[PDB]
Amino acid sequence: SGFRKMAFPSGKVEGCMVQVTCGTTTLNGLWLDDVVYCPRHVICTSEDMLNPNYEDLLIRKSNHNFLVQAGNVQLRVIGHSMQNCVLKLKVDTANPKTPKYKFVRIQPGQTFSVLACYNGSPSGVYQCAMRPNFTIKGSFLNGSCGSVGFNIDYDCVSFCYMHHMELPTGVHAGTDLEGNFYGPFVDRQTAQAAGTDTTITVNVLAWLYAAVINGDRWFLNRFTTTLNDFNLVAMKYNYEPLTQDHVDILGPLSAQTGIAVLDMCASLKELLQNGMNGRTILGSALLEDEFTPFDVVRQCSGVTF
Amino acid sequence: SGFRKMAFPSGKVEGCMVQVTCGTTTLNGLWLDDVVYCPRHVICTSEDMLNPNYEDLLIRKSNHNFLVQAGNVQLRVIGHSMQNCVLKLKVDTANPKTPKYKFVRIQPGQTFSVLACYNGSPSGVYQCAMRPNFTIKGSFLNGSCGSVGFNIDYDCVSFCYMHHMELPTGVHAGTDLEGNFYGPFVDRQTAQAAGTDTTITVNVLAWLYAAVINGDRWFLNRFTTTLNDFNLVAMKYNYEPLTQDHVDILGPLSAQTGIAVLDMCASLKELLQNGMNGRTILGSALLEDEFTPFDVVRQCSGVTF
Numbered sequence: 001s002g003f004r005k006m007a008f009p010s011g012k013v014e015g016c017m018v019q020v021t022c023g024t025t026t027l028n029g030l031w032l033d034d035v036v037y038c039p040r041h042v043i044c045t046s047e048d049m050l051n052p053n054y055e056d057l058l059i060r061k062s063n064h065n066f067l068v069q070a071g072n073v074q075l076r077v078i079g080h081s082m083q084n085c086v087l088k089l090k091v092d093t094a095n096p097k098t099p100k101y102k103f104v105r106i107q108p109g110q111t112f113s114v115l116a117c118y119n120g121s122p123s124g125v126y127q128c129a130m131r132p133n134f135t136i137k138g139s140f141l142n143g144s145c146g147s148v149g150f151n152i153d154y155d156c157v158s159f160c161y162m163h164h165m166e167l168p169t170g171v172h173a174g175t176d177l178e179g180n181f182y183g184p185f186v187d188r189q190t191a192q193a194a195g196t197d198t199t200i201t202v203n204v205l206a207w208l209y210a211a212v213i214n215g216d217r218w219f220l221n222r223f224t225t226t227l228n229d230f231n232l233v234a235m236k237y238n239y240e241p242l243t244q245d246h247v248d249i250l251g252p253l254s255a256q257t258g259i260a261v262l263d264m265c266a267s268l269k270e271l272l273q274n275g276m277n278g279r280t281i282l283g284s285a286l287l288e289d290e291f292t293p294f295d296v297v298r299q300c301s302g303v304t305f
Numbered sequence: 306s307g308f309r310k311m312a313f314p315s316g317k318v319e320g321c322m323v324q325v326t327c328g329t330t331t332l333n334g335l336w337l338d339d340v341v342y343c344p345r346h347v348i349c350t351s352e353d354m355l356n357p358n359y360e361d362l363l364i365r366k367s368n369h370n371f372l373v374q375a376g377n378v379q380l381r382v383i384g385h386s387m388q389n390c391v392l393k394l395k396v397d398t399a400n401p402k403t404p405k406y407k408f409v410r411i412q413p414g415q416t417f418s419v420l421a422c423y424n425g426s427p428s429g430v431y432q433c434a435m436r437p438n439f440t441i442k443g444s445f446l447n448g449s450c451g452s453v454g455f456n457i458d459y460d461c462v463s464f465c466y467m468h469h470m471e472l473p474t475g476v477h478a479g480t481d482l483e484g485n486f487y488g489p490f491v492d493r494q495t496a497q498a499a500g501t502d503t504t505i506t507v508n509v510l511a512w513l514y515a516a517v518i519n520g521d522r523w524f525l526n527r528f529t530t531t532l533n534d535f536n537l538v539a540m541k542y543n544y545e546p547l548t549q550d551h552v553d554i555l556g557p558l559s560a561q562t563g564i565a566v567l568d569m570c571a572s573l574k575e576l577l578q579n580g581m582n583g584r585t586i587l588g589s590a591l592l593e594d595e596f597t598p599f600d601v602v603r604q605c606s607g608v609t610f
């Protein structure tokens with residue numbers, strides 16, 4: 001039993017973290033095979049942060065301008081190229097700790113584990129979710145850029161995020177491992193504002209399903225709801241609209257617990273108007289939205305309590 | 306910016322997880338040097354678990370009765386002994402991935418990272434706290450027995466916990482790596498109840514200091530109090546008594562934020578008597594008590610390993 005915000009074991013990602021230094025800037029890089037991936041803004045200088053011409057800044061760089069350090073070994077860069085907002089530094093040595101990996105671009109509401117690193121060495125691991133406004137609520141300090149988000153289904157590490165910058169609201173923005181930013185952000189220090197954040201409704205519903213599997217039912221009710229009537233109420237609480245895709249995805253959890261998806265939706269509608277009245281669900285006085293339907297099936301049992 | 310429940314990087318511990326099989330029971334083991342540590346109830350049949358005489362059953366078992374799988378290569382057992390509630394299996398090969406490590410026993414209210422494994426394969430990591438009733442609110446399923454809790458200080462991994470059993474309330478109980486149980490529990494199928502848990506007061510204050518560091522300041526007030534007067538309030542809301550060493554431990558956080566510990570206790574006292582008044586603190590509608598003062602300092606400073 002129990003339900004914790006679990007992260008994937010970070011071992012396969014720790015063996016890939018290095019330190020990339022260009023000029024006076026030092027951040028982290030991801031060492032896969034013979035390529036080191038890092039944010040391209042490592043080549044920015046102090047006055048190249050508001051409107052950096054990355055193509056112009058990169059054409060002035062030679063291979064020996066990039067100091068790559070894996071632990072205490074110093075990797076020699078034998079080539080470099082830019083792909084969107086990430087730098088790809090070709091190195092002399094293939095990382096022998098390179099795992100079964102691949103690059104995937106996730107969608108809002110998806111979860112992943114973050115390995116917060118500084119100066120190339122890992123500091124901690126926690127779980128995140130791509131917010132609907134394409135930001136993530138992470139734990140990043142100065143020098144954390146280059147830290148990567150990932151999922152480890154089976155024995156394959158699916159890299160889906162690389163940290164680039166922190167917005168003024170304290171949230172974080174980054175790119176996939178191909179350099180394409182999540183959301184309408186750019187790697188410039190001009191003041192950018194993340195869109196208004198909404199609650200990931202499909203994740204909340206799955207999380208309520210996780211509570212029923214673990215033996216908690218106080219929040220259910222005898223009512224149902226149409227899909228449209230639910231969204232009309234949910235948007236008044238800043239909730240992401242619930243689509244037929246989400247209803248389908250919740251099917252297996254619905255079949256396991258015996259509660260129809262729209263019945264769980266009516267219980268959520270009631271929870272939003274009543275609160276929890278001094279009670280908790282799975283150990284929290286808020287409605288958690290960082291557990292996907294996929295996360296619930298993996299973490300929870302196959303037999304309901 | 307940002308504050309997440311962060312776990313230590315599990316890389317150094319992942320390389321020590323093996324699968325231990327005795328008969329039909331298969332659980333996880335910790336492979337350090339040429340010894341595999343695992344719960345002693347692995348030798349127990351479901352029939353023996355009701356009232357087992359562990360030494361009586363261990364003499365009948367032998368080295369060959371213990372199948373230890375490290376990844377997908379077989380380990381040969383050359384000896385077996387018992388220390389308290391954990392089984393020590395002498396194996397023919399020293400683990401080349403054995404990191405710098407210690408065996409330590411933690412106090413209640415101290416936090417640690419848990420690497421949940423199944424069939425010797427780590428599947429998740431999360432941050433726990435040793436509850437004042439000596440249980441832990443983990444997330445464990447069938448086969449997770451032998452999952453270990455650990456901390457890291459520099460390059461040394463202090464093993465502090467090994468999972469043994471689940472309590473009927475969904476919480477979990479286990480031993481240190483020397484076989485000494487945490488709390489008034491035994492490794493046998495009998496009626497065992499977790500005592501009425503309390504809230505770790507020093508951790509709440511630490512988590513409140515972490516909220517102030519991240520700009521969450523609405524709960525601060527002009528008032529202070531005494532250690533006497535607060536401990537009365539703490540006793541009435543089932544909070545652990547705040548000691549003088551608890552305040553000294555919070556010393557650095559009091560100077561960094563300019564908020565005295567008894568000044569913060571007044572804020573926590575008002576938060577206990579009046580609630581959060583519809584607001585949240587670090588994205589929580591509850592008073593989080595699973596961040597030690599060190600955990601706050603470490604996450605708000607970027608200590609790596």
Ligand SMILES: NCc1ccc(-c2ccccc2)nc1
Binds near residue numbers: 184185186191193
């Ligand atoms: N208000 C300052 C500012 C300047 C530029 C941008 C921007 C965002 C996305 C793409 C291109 C430019 N946003 C805000």
Ligand code: NA
Binds near residue numbers: 524528529568
């Ligand atoms: Na105060």
